[PDB]
Amino acid sequence: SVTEFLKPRLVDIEQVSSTHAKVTLEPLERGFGHTLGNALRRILLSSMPGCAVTEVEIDGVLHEYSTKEGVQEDILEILLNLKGLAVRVQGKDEVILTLNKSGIGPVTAADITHDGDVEIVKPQHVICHLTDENASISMRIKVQRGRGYVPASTRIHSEEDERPIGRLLVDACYSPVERIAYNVEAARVEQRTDLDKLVIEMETNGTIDPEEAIRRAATILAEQLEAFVDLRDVR
Amino acid sequence: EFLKPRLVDIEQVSSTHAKVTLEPLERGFGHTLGNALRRILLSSMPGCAVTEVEIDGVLHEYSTKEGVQEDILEILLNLKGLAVRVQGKDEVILTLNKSGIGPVTAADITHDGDVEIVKPQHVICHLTDENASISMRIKVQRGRGYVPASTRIHSEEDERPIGRLLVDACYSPVERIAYNVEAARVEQRTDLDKLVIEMETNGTIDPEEAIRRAATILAEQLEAFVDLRDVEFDPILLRPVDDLELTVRSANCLKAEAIHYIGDLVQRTEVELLKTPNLGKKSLTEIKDVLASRGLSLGMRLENWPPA
Amino acid sequence: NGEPIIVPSQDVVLGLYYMTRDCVNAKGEGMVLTGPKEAERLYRSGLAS
Amino acid sequence: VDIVLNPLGVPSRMNIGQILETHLGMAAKGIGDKINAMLKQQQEVAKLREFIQRAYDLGADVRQKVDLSTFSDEEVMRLAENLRKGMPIATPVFDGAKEAEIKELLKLGDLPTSGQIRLYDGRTGEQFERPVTVGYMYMLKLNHLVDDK
Amino acid sequence: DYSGRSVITVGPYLRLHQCGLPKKMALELFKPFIYGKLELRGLATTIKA
Amino acid sequence: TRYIVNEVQDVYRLQGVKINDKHIEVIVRQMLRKATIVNAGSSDFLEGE
Amino acid sequence: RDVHPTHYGRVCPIETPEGPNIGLINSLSVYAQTNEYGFLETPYRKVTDGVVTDEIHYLSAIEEGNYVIAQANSNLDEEGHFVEDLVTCRSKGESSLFSRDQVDYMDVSTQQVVSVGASLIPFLEHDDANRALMGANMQRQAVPTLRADKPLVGTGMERAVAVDSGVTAVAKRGGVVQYVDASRIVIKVNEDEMYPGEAGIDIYNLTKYTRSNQNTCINQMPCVSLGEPVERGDVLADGPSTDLGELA
Amino acid sequence: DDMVIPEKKHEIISEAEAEVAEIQEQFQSGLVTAGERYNKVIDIWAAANDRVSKAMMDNLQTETVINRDGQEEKQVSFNSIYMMADSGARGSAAQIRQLAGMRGLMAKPDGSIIETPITANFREGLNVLQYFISTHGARKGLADTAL
RNA sequence: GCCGCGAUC
């Protein structure tokens, strides 16, 4: 009677494409659905290891607002495009990658210089549509491994404005989660009628299977409780 | 690369109030852990509460006892708030007898083996004359959540004698719990988070044990996430055919038609089996007669037919 | 009259009105974000209003 | 909280008695909670008597001339244990407590004067953006039960 | 007949085409359907059962 | 029909309710039967049919 | 079914049934009574010169249409004069502002207009008239719960409703209580007032759980514990939905 | 506190009372008939009601003034009652006018209008006569709806 | 087979 709880069995997973998943767990005891959903959502959203671009350097003027030398897109637009880029780095805190294209044609992520340590998941991602015609665009990017989401509040690095111009304050989305949202419905087992079922919906920016994202969130939450569960453990 | 919280600097304010501190925490984990622990502790915590009582002269809850200052219904309400701590057992019986003048409290409950009454000043009734007595037997149980007296039926499997009073059970020792998030005093680390959980119980559970119980409940619940993967019933039927004491002529006819089970015969309507060779008008009546004796008239319709 | 009789009212209308309003100064001004997906992430994280 | 009501029912039905009653009951329960906490520490009779006296004569030229000076020791404790759940104040029908008096009563109990508190959600634990008016309202259970309907 | 009557409350988890019906009004409105399904599956050979 | 529809809608439209003109013209048609006759020859004379 | 301006202090303008019977069923106001002939009166205070006396005169519907009647919510001075030279009043069915020397009668209290049912609504003036009607009608339908619970905010009229309803048990001549039971209360009357001969004590037989007309239960639970002095008119047992003589 | 009281209510009430006193003096002079003064007092009271409702609306619409990145700026207020009224969820400006502005002219013993209106709102108190006067309209509406 | 009375939307 006491100390025993209904564990979720026969879960349902409906994978869509390669980054969209709708996980479902049933049945959970009354009130546990909200607790689990909120905890996993907060962990997946606010604190998760990942990588995203932080600094860019475009040859020419370094002001935030610029003429953009006629690349058919404003520098704000190409800053927006670079934010959604998803990268993978193998055991390096920071790394610099440079892109260069000459000749008419939209730029993709595959045109960055090849590095065996930096892995690109979506090389067809479009950044810009070349400097109008008969011109070239030079841009070097730096990407570092972070955690959660860090907006472009400030640089506060190097001296004076050397670092802010050297970074352009690109927003960083380290956590590889595009959207996580959970819904708790009602399910019943045997005579009991008031039980909770949890429906987890998540889309990923790439580099991680949504199953793996849930697994990482769960394992870090569980390992956060070792100091309390170690002594009072079944095994 | 994540700091692990350590339960340190636990302090007790009163016999019920308690503050538990979790010193090392990351940026956003303080609120997450606080909310999860608060919900777990408020929802499902083991505890002991009175399940049913038995007073000597009463017959139901809507009566009165001569010499006492309160109704039996009121006495059940003062008993519902009684909190006990039992060790090693779950069906402890608390018998109390008292005579005289003045309030009767939990302090005069007979001293059982291992049962600690958290507060001995909890009044449950008042006596008003010298010569009247009250003798009751209280049964306490261990549970997890709110269990009303009306809802439970398994306790009625054995008949309850007239005189057994049923009282609702709460089983939740935690009455109030709130958490607070502050900045840790660690200066070598840039900014660290600490969590303090103010918990107010009825004294039945240890705050550290309560936090441990919440943590292990959460860990066991999360264990299902760290490995996702996953990507003819009536006894009268289903009987041997040769049990209806039929005639010799029907025995061979049924074998040729392959009626080896009772339920197969009952599904045949009267207009179609007559086409069977040498069925017999009088013999057909015999099959109908014996099947009417069991109450199984010809013409029923089933859905599923297992081979056995 | 042809108007949709099944139309949200009361709390639903209040919620939609509160969601679609503009404040002169709040958490997040002039921020540029990829799309509606980032708007939910920023709001649910508390970094924006 | 024990009951959650819909704010959308006040401005159209013009039940301002709901809001003022909730604020005034919140003030009364704050006073009762102060007295209960004071009884929890079993402080001296003089301090409790002084607090009850300062909480009884509060108002604006009220016709209430009660005083604990003519109250002996044992009845003061009985009164304080009788109103630990809440100071049961009474506002006559058409001439009663004003907004200023309710605000002073709230301030006496160390409560927000505006009558609204920051309420956290029970499920997600996220602070509600606007303050929510929390108070103690007297709710009756009518004689129209579904068990009979 | 085959009609019930009870007080109505609000269900926000419901779809646009769903209404919450108590299981005590059901099993009374749908009694003959229950008899038919019980007899079809062989749980009760006779109607009295 | 123009008089009745406008006069009926005038009372309705003032209180801010929307009623389409067809629903008023439908009722008017049922008010415009049973004509009188000022001729004969077809087994009808000075009667309302 | 309309509220005639002479329904001021004799018939409640709030409490009345809603749908079919509105305006046909009324409720007497708190201070109203009947004439020797059968006409409703209402108390008023005589005003001589500019000072309102404490003498009380009972005015019928016909008589009150001649004098000039002041307002209950009008300020006074220490001696009794009005604080302003201009005072709102009611002359003959209408209301205007008159001189301090022209005032002839004074309203006894602010509860005069309302009835008993509408008197127990705090902040009644802040409520709409129809919503006050609905609240007053709905108060008469609440079922008495298991435990009585006093209103944290009331109108002071709860005690009068509870005491005079006959539901509670009031000590007729009680002195010091001698023995309190869950069903009986016996009081030994103080010696200062006794009936000569045979002495005697006052015994109350409380009525335990008993069916009411609307199938609800009627219960009486004692208040006094033991040896508690009890004065004339004190409440000993509080009936259904009553806490220490307070309608709850 | 969400029923923000206009600060100019008492001043315009005082000026309306002054105008009413002036017209009463005019009637005492004998050059004004009863009908003329009655219609004029109804007109001025209606104008005062319109003015107080309008002033309440200006005080309540854009009450919130919040500093931008530079200097100070005003915008539509986040008052909960104003949000409920403007969003159309429940209530309307007419019903708001009876919570912070004056209640205004109201009378139906037979269909006439009393000269003196109800100058108190529900946020503040109402004395016996103002409540008793509003009872006429409330009872008339409740009886009309049922019939 | 109703008649009165009270109540709900």
Swiss-Prot record, chain A:
Enzyme class label: transferase
Keyword Transferase: yes
Catalytic activity entry: RNA(n) + a ribonucleoside 5'-triphosphate = RNA(n+1) + diphosphate
A GO MF term: DNA binding
EC number(s) reported in the record: 2.7.7.6
Chain positions covered by the region annotation Required for interaction with Crp at class II promoters: 159-162
Region (Alpha N-terminal domain (alpha-NTD)): 1-232
Nucleotidyltransferase as UniProt keyword: yes
PTM summary: (Microbial infection) ADP-ribosylated on both alpha subunits by the phage T4 protein ModA. ADP-ribosylated on only one of the alpha subunits by the phage T4 protein Alt.
Example of a GO biological process term: response to heat
CC terms in the record's Gene Ontology section: cytoplasm; cytosol; cytosolic DNA-directed RNA polymerase complex; membrane; transcription elongation factor complex
Source organism, top-level taxon: Bacteria
Keywords: Acetylation, ADP-ribosylation, DNA-directed RNA polymerase, Nucleotidyltransferase, Transcription, Transferase
Domain notes: The N-terminal domain is essential for RNAP assembly and basal transcription, whereas the C-terminal domain is involved in interaction with transcriptional regulators (such as CRP) and with upstream promoter elements.
Assembly description: Homodimer. The RNAP catalytic core consists of 2 alpha, 1 beta, 1 beta' and 1 omega subunit. When a sigma factor is associated with the core the holoenzyme is formed, which can initiate transcription. Both the N- and C-terminus interact with different regions of transcriptional regulator CRP. The rRNA transcription and antitermination complex (rrnTAC) consists of RNAP, NusA, NusB, NusE (rpsJ), NusG, SubB, ribosomal protein S4, DNA and precursor rRNA; S4 is more flexible than other subunits.
Membership in a protein family: Belongs to the RNA polymerase alpha chain family.
Protein name per UniProt: DNA-directed RNA polymerase subunit alpha
Source organism of this protein record: Escherichia coli (strain K12)
From Swiss-Prot, chain D:
Modified residues (N6-acetyllysine): 107
PTM annotation: Acetylated on several lysine residues in the presence of glucose.
Summary of the protein's practical applications: Co-administration of salinamide and rifampicin or salinamide and myxopyronin suppresses the emergence of resistance to both antibiotics.
Family, similarity comment: Belongs to the RNA polymerase beta chain family.
Purpose: DNA-dependent RNA polymerase (RNAP) catalyzes the transcription of DNA into RNA using the four ribonucleoside triphosphates as substrates.
Subunit structure: The RNAP catalytic core consists of 2 alpha, 1 beta, 1 beta' and 1 omega subunit. When a sigma factor is associated with the core the holoenzyme is formed, which can initiate transcription. The rRNA transcription and antitermination complex (rrnTAC) consists of RNAP, NusA, NusB, NusE (rpsJ), NusG, SubB, ribosomal protein S4, DNA and precursor rRNA; S4 is more flexible than other subunits. In pull-down experiments interacts with CedA.
Name of the protein this chain belongs to: DNA-directed RNA polymerase subunit beta
Lineage, uppermost ranks: Bacteria, Pseudomonadati, Pseudomonadota, Gammaproteobacteria, Enterobacterales
Coverage span on the entire protein: 1094 to 1242 of 1342
Curated annotation (Swiss-Prot), chain E:
Biotech relevance: Co-administration of salinamide and rifampicin or salinamide and myxopyronin suppresses the emergence of resistance to both antibiotics.
UniProt modification remark: Acetylated on several lysine residues in the presence of glucose.
Protein origin, superkingdom: Bacteria
Entry's family note: Belongs to the RNA polymerase beta' chain family.
Annotated function: DNA-dependent RNA polymerase (RNAP) catalyzes the transcription of DNA into RNA using the four ribonucleoside triphosphates as substrates.
Subunit note: The RNAP catalytic core consists of 2 alpha, 1 beta, 1 beta' and 1 omega subunit. When a sigma factor is associated with the core the holoenzyme is formed, which can initiate transcription. The rRNA transcription and antitermination complex (rrnTAC) consists of RNAP, NusA, NusB, NusE (rpsJ), NusG, SubB, ribosomal protein S4, DNA and precursor rRNA; S4 is more flexible than other subunits.
Protein name in UniProt: DNA-directed RNA polymerase subunit beta'
